[model samples]
Target: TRIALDPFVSDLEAESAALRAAGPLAAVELPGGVPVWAVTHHAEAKKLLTDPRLVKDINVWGAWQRGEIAPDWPLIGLANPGRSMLTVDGADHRRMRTLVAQALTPRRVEQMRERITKLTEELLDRLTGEVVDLKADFAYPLPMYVVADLMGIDEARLPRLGELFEKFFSTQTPPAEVIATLTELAGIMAETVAAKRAAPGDDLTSALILASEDGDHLTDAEIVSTLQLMVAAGHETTISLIVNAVVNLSTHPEQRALVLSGEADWSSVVEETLRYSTPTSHVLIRFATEDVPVGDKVLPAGDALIVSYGALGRDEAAHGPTAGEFDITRSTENRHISFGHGPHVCPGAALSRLEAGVALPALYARFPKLDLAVPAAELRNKPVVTQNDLFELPVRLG
Candidate 1:
């Protein structure tokens, strides 16, 4: 039986609980009536993430191959999406990931601490309002600027990218508008690549362009696609990470007190927030190359699948009975797969952690009386299946 998974789910936590109740490998329908299976259990998700039978190739999806998956489908950009490391497997995946990975190494990521701290201070100082949209003024800008600087992307283009990205990730985007947004994003990335080529710099984009210089190891297309992936993933996830952590701390004063009183580190707050409200909810559209058993259900060959990180993070079997609780003290280290698991684990994990670690403590230190402008229940989520993004995080910066 296929459960109707509402792509525009407003109460995400409630929906996640429902999905868990359905079963471990629940068959569900994505928006636009697309059929797919979701791995709702933690152990099962870890197993499938490494399974070779389930590949990232959109060609393996029967509906996509038959032209049933429309170019204007809300998730089309993600499903039959860009050709990057995200959409490939094996040697191709390794080759694309290696060059990018070397640049984002833990030590390399740690070195950005001073720069990130300066950016955080610069943004915080600009907040003049007694009441501010923390998401708009702080959370969003921090990562966007951090990632843009890393990629050597011009800060002037940020507004356009923001507008395009809202449409890019939303499930509510109209069919015609979906294709238009994709085109605009492609044009933006292409122009960025052209500018980087004219004058190389000490940036990830320039490094990627140079990696291709020796031979066809990194093609122009690959360079553009990789930049697109990095720019989007680098900032978007961290934006939510900061937003969610602040929301959680504001609501849970006891936990906030612990951090404020020097009992728990800011890093603990970051990790707990990741587990409690994962930045990326449901990763879209992987495929089953052959029928594979998951718990009692079998994912048939050529069918689509998604690893529901939202459900996996809160899985009772993984984190015990207190799995759903938002506790900074929970033993979450090396336990959750919010950054994902296996060969496809997010390379930006350290960078995200560093940005949050530096920003959160500084934020609370500056505005010790930060409180939500609206009740938690009143805050709305974006109508997007993949990202757990807020429409805005209004806070009274006391």
Candidate 2:
């Protein structure tokens, strides 16, 4: 929270460097009133993530048992403490993962590639002949439109619906405002749920709505939460990536030309992009279920451990000197901690990569002269969601 919730600390690159050098098992105090161990080495991070010792269940302390106020902010119950596949461990975790995995087969995400390309083209068509914010005009809208359509949201209401979600993730907004946004979501989702319940369609929402058709696995609440998670996770992080990739291209004319020439390989470029400009930069906090050695240091039971994904992405031991530099041609796949590793590696990592593969090149091809309108330094990063933007990259095609 200190890294994000605090009013300062805007130099993300510097902060990342510091943490990465702190080593794999370094201890650091976090603003959330908890002492956290920040893991930055690739080997240690991998071991830490997969080791049966660490647990992603943030509520393992039974924070609920402490009689803490259960915040009814909808996504709070769903995302922050991370009850989704991102935070579960062991059997129940594996079962839920299997269900989501079945739905998100590699072929399935691949199938959406053409559709995503079309969506990128359509977005570009609407912005021709105008100097517009690429983020607002294309980056932000494209993913929301795709995710909204996938989740059964009315096409007409998506603009407003996306705004509500945007507000919900902004820390600058008051708690009351966040609640109001969720209230709006409840009404919208309730109506969508009712409609889908009445007559199911062929989208992700409909598929999830009928998850029990095969004779029971996920409950209605679990199904709803799953869809909620799918929508949020499916689009938001990937959108951030798309925006960053665009910015990198805009900043590096040579790199843009290389991509245009088809000499830039997507695999290395995308992996390097994930590291060079990490969006989700915070270490995901996990609780130590038992005393375990992380490198040479031993963490006692119930200790709070943070996997510094942002920092680890560029750690010297991980990526070498190229860690601090952005070179699409640089092979740094082994240095990647972008999606995570271990038992909790992000399930949608492949799909997200696919989305960027289609989205980025399609965008550059559609608007060959696209460039940022605002100065890079002037861009504002959303505080709550560190390494993201509520508004940045006001851009347009030349």
Candidate 3:
């Protein structure tokens, strides 16, 4: 039976609960009547994520080949984003990901601790108002600027970039605007590529240009697409990670007290947040290159599969009976694959975690009495299916 993931009229958790109930692997329908298979269990998701038979190429998706997926589909950016680490598999993925991945390794990301700490302090200082929307004022800007600084993006483009991503990630973006959104988004990255080419700097874009100039390192489109992918995933996911941590801590005071009393480290807080309330709800459109057996069910070749992180994070089989509870000190073995399980494990994981480590500890330390100004239930998530994000996190910074 195919389950419909309708988070518009309902919320994600309710739908995810049903998906998990359906079985380990369930056929599911995305909005707009698009049918896809969802990996609902933690174990199956771990297996399929690393499976060689499940390729990342959208060209292999039978529906697109059959003229079913449209260019105007609101999720086109996610499904058919141009060639980069996100779209390729095997050797192509390795080559595209290596350079970007190198910069995000633990040692390199840790080097940014001082800078990240300084930025966190500065951002916290700007939280002068008693009531601040943590989502907008705090969690949002830090990652955006941090990633932008690394990539050497035009400072002027930062605000517009956020706007485009809001549309890019939104399931409700007008169908007519989808193609234009992708075009403008790519155009902005291309402009940055040209600008960097003209006057290289000590930034990722310039480094990419130098590499591209040196023999068969990277293509022009690959460079721009890589930039686009990094900015999109690198920042947005961190923003949510930070936001979700704050929300979790604020709501669970016992958990908050454990961290506040210095009995628990911020790393636990970050890891638990990534598992309990992952930033990304679902990843789209991996095609089965061959029929793959998952938990006694065969995923036929050419069918698109979605990994529902929202469901898997709280999977009882992985986390046990109290998986639903928010416990920072839950266990040392973090079974949740929120960063990912296999070759696709995000290179940005270290960077995102480092930012949260500095930002979260500093955030609560600065505020001391921060809590939601509005009740938690009043807070609503943004209408972006792929992202586990809030529209605003209105809070009292006491």
Candidate 4:
């Protein structure tokens, strides 16, 4: 059955519920009538995410390989994206990811705690407006700055980073605009790489440059591409994570009370948000190198597949009958794959968690009366299908 998914669904929860009702693995249409199979069950998605036959090689995609995927495809950035850790498989994927992984290990992320806390406090002190766009004022900048500081991005270039990502993630962006955004982003990253090479700093970007110089087998193109990937994913997902957590907590007063009263920790709140309101809605375009069975359906060889994280998070089979409900009290061991699963699990997961674990509690503690300035139903998500993000989160910091 063909499921015609609305690329611009106003209510993400309603849409996810419909996807779950469709079945575990369903055929769905993307924005441009692009058809693909989606894994809607948590167990199946976990299996496929690690399946060798289901690879990350975009060249395996029959449509893209046949030139059927247009360069101007709004989601082309995610579909046939540049050569990087995200697009490769096997030895190549391991080779590309290892260096970065070593840098972002658990110990390294913990070291950033002092830096993240300091940044959060600095931003909170700068909040002057009575009714702040929390998404803009707090949620967005925190991760951006944290990632930037880690990667040695200059504070001056932060605004441009925001502009480029806005176009990068939005489905509403026109084809020409998409090309321009990619071009401009590439240029910015290239310049950053050149600067780091000239004068190394105590930052990740500089470390990557030094690695390349010290014969780590990393090419200049790889360095630039890796930096671009890190800068984009490192912050964007975390920004939405923080934003979504606030939205869920504020609207669910009982859950909010549990945290406020110390019945539940902020870590629980963060983990629940990762599951109940996932930052990433649908990861784009993985390919089936051969026919793969999922639930009673077989994804044919060379066909495209997407792991519908939105649907999987609330899978009744995985999380039980109360899947759709938001409950931070849910067991942390429920095995939610919000950060993804298997070999490709996100390297920045620890950093994102630390930032949220620090930011959310600090936010509520500071403004015990923080409430949505507008009705929760009135808030709208950005038109991007891949990310679960809001246009703005208006709130009164009482």
**Among all candidates shown, the one with the greatest TM-score:** 4
Sliding window of 10 residues with minimal summed lDDT for model 4:
209-218
RMSD (Å) of each candidate, 1 decimal: 2.7, 3.7, 2.8, 2.5
* Tens-place lDDT digits, model 3, residues 1-398: 78877655257778778888888889898777789999989989989998989988987899999998776776777788766788888987767666655434566567678878888898888888789899888888898777767777798988887788778766577767867888998897788889988999866677776763225576678788787777777777898898899899989999899999999999989999998899988898699988999988899999999998988899988888888878888873446799887888887888898899999889888988999999888888876777888888898998
In model 2, pairs of residues that clash are none
Candidates 1 and 3 compared: the better one by lDDT is: 1
**Could you tell which candidate, 2 or 4, scores higher by TM-score?**
4
lDDT of 4 at 84: 84
Global Cα lDDT for candidate 4: 0.82
Q: Give the TM-score of candidate 2.
A: 0.86
lDDT of each: 0.83, 0.68, 0.82, 0.82
Model 3 residue runs over 4 Å out of place are 154-202, 209-216, 332-334
TM-scores for candidates 1 onward, in order: 0.91, 0.86, 0.90, 0.92
Predicted candidate 2 versus true structure: per-residue lDDT over 266-350, tens digit per residue: 6655777788776776654677778888767797776667776767777777677867777888764475878877666677787
- Compose the digit string of candidate 4's lDDT tens values, residues 1-398: 77766777677787788778778788888888788988888988899989989888877889888888767776776787767888887888877677776555687678788899898988888888789998878887787778778877777888887788778766577879978998987787778778888988777777676553235657778877887787667777898888989899889999898999999989888888898888888998789988998887789999988888988898878788788889988763357999888778887788889999999888888898898999888988887787888889999999
Please rank every candidate by TM-score, starting with the best: 4, 1, 3, 2
Better of 1 and 4 by lDDT: 1
**Which residue pairs come into collision in candidate 4?**
none
